[PDB]
Amino acid sequence: VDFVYRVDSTPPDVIFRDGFSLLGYNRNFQQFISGRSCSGGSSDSRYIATTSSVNQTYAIARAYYSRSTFKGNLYRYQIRADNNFYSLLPSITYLETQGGHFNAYEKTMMRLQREYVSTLSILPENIQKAVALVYDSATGLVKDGVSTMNASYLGLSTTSNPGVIPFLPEPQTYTQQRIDAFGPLISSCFSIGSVCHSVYNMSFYDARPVIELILSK
Amino acid sequence: AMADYDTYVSNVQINNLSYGVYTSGGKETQFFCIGLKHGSEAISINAMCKVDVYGNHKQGFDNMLNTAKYYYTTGGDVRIYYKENVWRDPDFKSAFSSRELIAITTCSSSSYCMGPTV
Amino acid sequence: AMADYDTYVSNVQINNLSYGVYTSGGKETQFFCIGLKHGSEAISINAMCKVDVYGNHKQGFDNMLNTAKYYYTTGGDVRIYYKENVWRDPDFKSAFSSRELIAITTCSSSSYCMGPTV
Amino acid sequence: AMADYDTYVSNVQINNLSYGVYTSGGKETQFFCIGLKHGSEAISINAMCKVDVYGNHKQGFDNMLNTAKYYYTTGGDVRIYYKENVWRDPDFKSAFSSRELIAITTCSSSSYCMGPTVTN
Amino acid sequence: AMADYDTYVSNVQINNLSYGVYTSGGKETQFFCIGLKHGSEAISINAMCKVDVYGNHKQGFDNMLNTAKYYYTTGGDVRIYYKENVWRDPDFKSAFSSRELIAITTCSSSSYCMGPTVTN
Amino acid sequence: AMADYDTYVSNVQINNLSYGVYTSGGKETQFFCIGLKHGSEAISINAMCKVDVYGNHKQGFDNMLNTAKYYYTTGGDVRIYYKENVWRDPDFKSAFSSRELIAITTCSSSSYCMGPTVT
Amino acid sequence: NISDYKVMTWNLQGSSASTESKWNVNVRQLLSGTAGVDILMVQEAGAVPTSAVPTGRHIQPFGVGIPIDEYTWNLGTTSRQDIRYIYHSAIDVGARRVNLAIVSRQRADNVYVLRPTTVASRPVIGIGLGNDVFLTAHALASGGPDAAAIVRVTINFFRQPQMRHLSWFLAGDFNRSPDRLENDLMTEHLERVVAVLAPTEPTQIGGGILDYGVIVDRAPYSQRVEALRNPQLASDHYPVAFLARSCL
């Protein structure tokens, strides 16, 4: 994919200066996909989650705007993907050839995310623009407001990495674990607090029971 | 306009659930009940039930049951349509509710939920 | 061309649901309705309903209902096939829609949804 | 006082499930049983069953099965209403339980669960 | 060799799903169709349907639908057994396929799926 | 003891599933089968099935099927009660096995699963 | 960004153990695993491990062209490889043993070699990974009088227009108190351009904080990098790690 997206409440004059920073050093892959190394868990992930879906970012913003206790504005950041951005599936496949097992809840979450992970911090050079998101209290919809183009952006001819994440820890023994989610089955790593900042801290539910319901009866 | 759709409570969450089998009036019933909150606030009208072989509308027991279970899981904002003074069993009324569950619809904002209004 | 498959909206998301029990025309009914949006924007053809004991196709009520619930949960892109001017209950049409839900298919991209086109 | 609702355990979680088919008393049955814990501790009454063609209430087999499975899935706090000394098959009673499952309600706090309570 | 299990594709994924109601040949029907991929590449054998009141095996409509929905949701590797040249409604055939879905089984590895196989 | 509950495998995981429609002995059937493993180990007793209109217990086809799908979803540890030498269709038996699936119970620890045991 | 890597500096000059033992036991300890150190700056390493394998890569460095040798070094087995890259500077001009090395988890895109103006001063070597450059240095033993000049030439090289996009981080044996280096930098009107990152505990056994880091303020999230002494004591110098602080 060429371009991916994140939502943040930090305004463009700050993000275009600093970029996005990793929570920590935790390379564990299934802890990242399940949200356990993200903001609702150990909050030390060595990855930044991005999505290729613009519609998902509308859902992220609605989940924040819909809360009575949330104040402030939200921006969608458009990010050029390069060789440090990985899709999930090749690493899913590779880790399975190491004896790793992902249950149906985790596989379900991963394919819904349309997720590309950055193994490094995301530089302002990769951030092309910011689009303010406007919330309509009467409809609950989120629309595009003012766009701001990043003068520091570099239009390099890169694209996302089609291979496996490097230095992946060898998979741990399988265990059923909570999967943090918010909104319509959005991984918690897409929350604003799942990148390190210079912020409203969304709460998450366990996606497993919800997924179990739509898979059964 | 729509009969039995005149009374509702909007933008609530289902925060409690009850499913049981019970003998009432010489008949073997199933019932379920939902409990409601309004965010962090408790509300007075916060329970309503559905019985499989009693009430104004006996149909839809399984579908309403699973629908209640779903919104209890998601915690999502919903509007509950209910009818008052239905259940006659005085032990059931005091244990649960005298209200019959009519319909459940979602709320896409603090202002709007699907379904008819006054 | 498949009869009743000529009118549809593509790449929408189900962003509202309604399920209820209701007396109409001397029959005890179940119904559900889906609310639609198109990414960021509202659309005019934004509600359509299915009734268990009425409509051009009474079969598949439970299956359609669970399918609607599914895509409401995931928020994924779907194509909605529907039929205009079905429901005759004037209170129902005003509260929900006159449209009967016919089919729901998945969209694997912004370009393609499964099923026939015109 | 709702009949069959005076015996229950509160603020427990379903931590085990059994489902099976079984011949009992010359009839083909289905049954399921739930196992209970109490947070991080065990509980002295921790098993109860439902049979599709036997018991004080034969209705609701599928809905009670689906509901038990749901709370196994969530691990959330429930109250379990049950009836003692119901199953008379001596093999089943010692393999699973003698108790019949009557109702399952949720507990929204450590001190409140939905449904009637006995005052003592 | 089990009858109607001689034709199948292995280690595929269900990446699209259609569910609808439809009058066909004077009968009210329900049907669903699955869309297939093979990892990265598309395949010609990519649409297979089931109809509740038509086909070589009308039983199991709900269970097959739930099964198809399951693997569409997880995106897991499956094997699809199907039967060619079944649906004779020309509008339905042109919109989807003529293949009747017969069975779905799981693929625990790149090289193994559960179910009967044929020699070649 | 409970009849048809004397044969079981404990602390296994369901790692494969089959569901299909099939004509057998002139009757239209549904069936499902479960594949098993024991942690990182393969086990020889690894497939057992249930048929909607055949077997020693024809009841509970959907409930057993949905239960099987659930423990396939979670990969949790289960005990499988089953019965040997039930299915007589030779094409079915060689494709899967002769075993009829009787019950599924959970194992909350490496040493305990729900239900009766034998000595 | 610098904070994305686990960085460490260690001076090998120490006790009775030879350099080979220091590589195969101590350095291995420090780098091993996915949680191991990603970037290790090493001083007074006269030889790379005997396990190391030359790559033959003809490295033509930015700055000045002294011979830098690239090596692969397997920390795992023949079946399960764990390949780290070693960049070693043996000697300068005629004689002058430099004995600087940087060990990296990934192959270097670019290599940098800088010289201060000070007469007998050892060069500064560095490796670029994407937008990040990691450099090491070893100031003169008589009080590190070239320490500020080490930092100065590094600042001035990477403030060139074609280099200003890069984040750089320098760590090594400065042979000078961090406070004294800070005052030198303030004297040279450079205290506001770089941040000195040093542990609170001595880094050589005699006492005194001699091994630490310097980072450009302009590097994004440079304020997250914290200097932390490692407890290891296989030489006269403790290793010093540079690790991102917890976010919150």
Author numbering:
A (entry chain G): 19 to 216, 224 to 242
B (entry chain A), C (entry chain D): 22 to 139
D (entry chain B), E (entry chain C): 22 to 141
F (entry chain E): 22 to 140
G (entry chain F): 23 to 270
Q: What does the paper behind this entry write?
A:
Typhoid toxin is an A2B5 protein toxin and an important virulence factor for the human-adapted bacterial pathogen Salmonella enterica serovar Typhi, the causative agent of typhoid fever. Typhoid toxin contains two enzymatic subunits, PltA and CdtB, which dock onto a pentameric delivery platform composed of the protein PltB. It was recently reported that the same enzymatic subunits can assemble with a different delivery platform composed of the protein PltC, forming a distinct version of typhoid toxin. Here, we determined atomic-level structures of the pentameric PltC subunit, the fully assembled PltC typhoid toxin, and the PltC pentamers in complex with glycan receptors.
To gain insight into the structural basis for the organization of PltC typhoid toxin, we determined the crystal structure of PltC-PltA-CdtB holotoxin at 2.29 Å resolution. Similar to the PltB typhoid toxin, PltC typhoid toxin also displays a pyramid-shaped architecture with the PltC homopentamer at the bottom and the two A subunits (CdtB-PltA) sitting on top. As in the PltB typhoid toxin, CdtB does not directly interact with the delivery platform and is tethered to the toxin primarily through the disulfide bond it forms with PltA. Interestingly, the PltA and CdtB subunits sit atop the delivery platform in a nearly identical fashion in both typhoid toxins; PltA and CdtB align with an RMSD of 0.292 Å over 383 Cα atoms in the structures of the two typhoid toxins. Despite the fact that PltC and PltB share very little sequence identity, their interactions with PltA are strikingly similar. In line with the global structural similarities of the PltC and PltB toxin, the C-terminal helix of PltA is inserted into the central pore in a manner that is overall similar in both typhoid toxins. Notably, the pore radius of the channel at the center of the PltC pentamer is generally narrower than that of the PltB pore. Close inspection of the side chain interactions between the PltA C-terminal tail and two different B subunit channels shows that all five monomers from the PltC pentamer interact with the PltA C-terminal tail via 9 direct or water-mediated hydrogen bonds. The charge distribution of the PltC and PltB channels is also very different in the upper part of the pore, the main region that interacts with the C-terminal α-helix of PltA; this region is highly positively charged in PltC and is more hydrophobic in PltB. However, a similar experiment wherein purified PltB toxin (CdtB-His6) was mixed with purified PltC-Strep pentamer showed significant displacement of PltB from PltB toxin by PltC at a 10:1 molar ratio. Together, these results show that PltC’s narrower pore and the stronger electrostatic interactions between this pore and the C-terminal helix of PltA enable PltC to outcompete PltB for assembling typhoid toxin.
